[PDB]
Amino acid sequence: QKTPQIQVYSRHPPENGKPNILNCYVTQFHPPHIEIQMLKNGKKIPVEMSDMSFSKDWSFYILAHTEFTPTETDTYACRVKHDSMAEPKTVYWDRDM
Amino acid sequence: IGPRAVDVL
Amino acid sequence: SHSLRYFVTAVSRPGFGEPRYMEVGYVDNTEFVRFDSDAENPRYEPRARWIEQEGPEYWERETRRAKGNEQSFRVDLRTALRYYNQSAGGSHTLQWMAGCDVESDGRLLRGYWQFAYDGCDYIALNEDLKTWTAADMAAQITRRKWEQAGAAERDRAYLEGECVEWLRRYLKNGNATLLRTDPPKAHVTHHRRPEGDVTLRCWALGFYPADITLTWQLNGEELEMELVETRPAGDGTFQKWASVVVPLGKEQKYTCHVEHEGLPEPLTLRW
Ligand SMILES: [K+]
């Protein structure tokens, strides 16, 4: 069992008001069964998922994304459930990272 | 083109 | 040098029915074909424009090979259950990587043919392309069967033969895409901290392929640095950043350095 590493970030440098894409990039997990959700102010967004790949160390990776328009005040997150962890792991978008 | 895994475990 | 590689995964689905079965092909780390048994009428599919030049014969023979592999993988999964004394009701995965790394002169630099069960090394063809490394007792049983069958000889024939030959063909036909590069567009961002000092973040954006070096220097010595893993933009290009914490008013003494195969030379920038 290998624990997923997550990054949450925009496609383009985030412009309040300018339309963009939010990504949730999940890597280094095994087994391949995983549940990934994207949240906007705590609520589930209805999200495309890349097809699954594995890397040369056998561990899987996938890219979730969704269309979005950043504002001063909207918070966003990626939540991941996988058998390697007791509890879902939530990572919040930081617009500077 | 890709390989064929014809020998089984 | 260049590489052609196939990455294959089978995942068993306890109850009744076929395992999930997937194959993906790469030339120098970029995906060009895929097969997925969960598609409606599953075929080998192109994943880039350049490989679409291949005719219906290619697509049909590759689809057939994938479906043949699906059956071998099904047998493989059931055999693995017996060797490890596992029950039918759990999900298990078998992965395989095979392919060739080839030099300028056309020499085969390394061939690969290796398997993992449930995420751990199972059996691998050694660099000599004649003997197998077996991770455990199950894989020793497999090894003895493959030694008797002369598996390695046939595997090596693919890796030295078709693998090399097809890689050269793909590079000839698709080198505009496969060898394409997009240099990084870099900039520095400036973030005052509550502590009164500044984070400088050096961004590299829009680059292809993935490999890049980002560093920070102070008085032209390297150094303190936070550095995210290279990540996909979602449009085929990659992103990375590196950051340091510096005094407010001393931003100008720090330089960010970017090396990437798409650049005519190393990039040097500041706030
Ligand atoms: K192929």
Assign domain C2-179 to its CATH architecture: 2-Layer Sandwich (3.30)
On the CB side of A37, how many CA atoms lie within 13 Å of its CA?
Answer: 14
Which residues sit opposite C111 in a β-bridge?
Answer: C100
Domains and CATH numbers, chain A: 5-92 (2.60.40.10)
End-to-end alpha-carbon separation of chain C, Å? Answer: 37
**B9: chain C residues, CB-CB within 8 Å:** 75-76, 79-80, 83, 138, 141-142, 145
Q: Which residues of A38-62 are buried (b: 16+ CB within 10 A; e: fewer)?
A: bbeeeeebeeeeeebbbeeebbbbb
Helices C56-83 and C137-149: angle between axes, nearest 10 degrees: 130
C-alpha C114/C-alpha C55 separation (Å) is 30
The CA distance from C94 to C73, in Å, is 8
Beta strands in C126-269 (DSSP E): 132-134, 185-192, 198-207, 213-218, 221-222, 226-227, 231-232, 238-246, 254-259, 267-269
Sorted by sequence, the CB contacts under 8 Å of residue A80 that are 6+ apart come out as A4, A6, A24, A26, A34, A35, A36, A37, A88, A89, A90, A91
φ, ψ of residue C215 in degrees (nearest 5) = -140, 160
Write the DSSP symbol of residue C182.
B
Q: What is the CATH number of domain C185-269?
A: 2.60.40.10
Asked if C213 and C259 count as a contact pair (C-beta separation under 8 A), the reply is yes
Domain boundaries, chain C: 2-179, 185-269
Q: Name beta bridge partners: C267.
A: C258
- Helix C151-160 × helix C162-178 angle, to 10°: 40
According to DSSP, the residues that pair with A5 across neighbouring strands are: A27
Q: Give dist(CA C261, CA C27) in Å, integer.
A: 17
| CB-based contact B4 C69, cutoff 8 Å | yes
Separation between Cα atoms, residue A40 and residue A45, nearest integer Å: 6
Angstrom distance (rounded) from CA A12 to CA C198: 23
Q: Which of C116, C110, C105 is nearest to C10 (CA)?
A: C116
How far apart CA C114 and CA C177 sit, in angstroms, is: 28
What distance in Å separates the CA atoms of residue C175 and residue C172, rounded to the nearest whole number? 6
Are the Cβ atoms of C231 and A54 closer than 8 angstroms? Answer: no
**What is the identity of the amino acid at A17?**
G
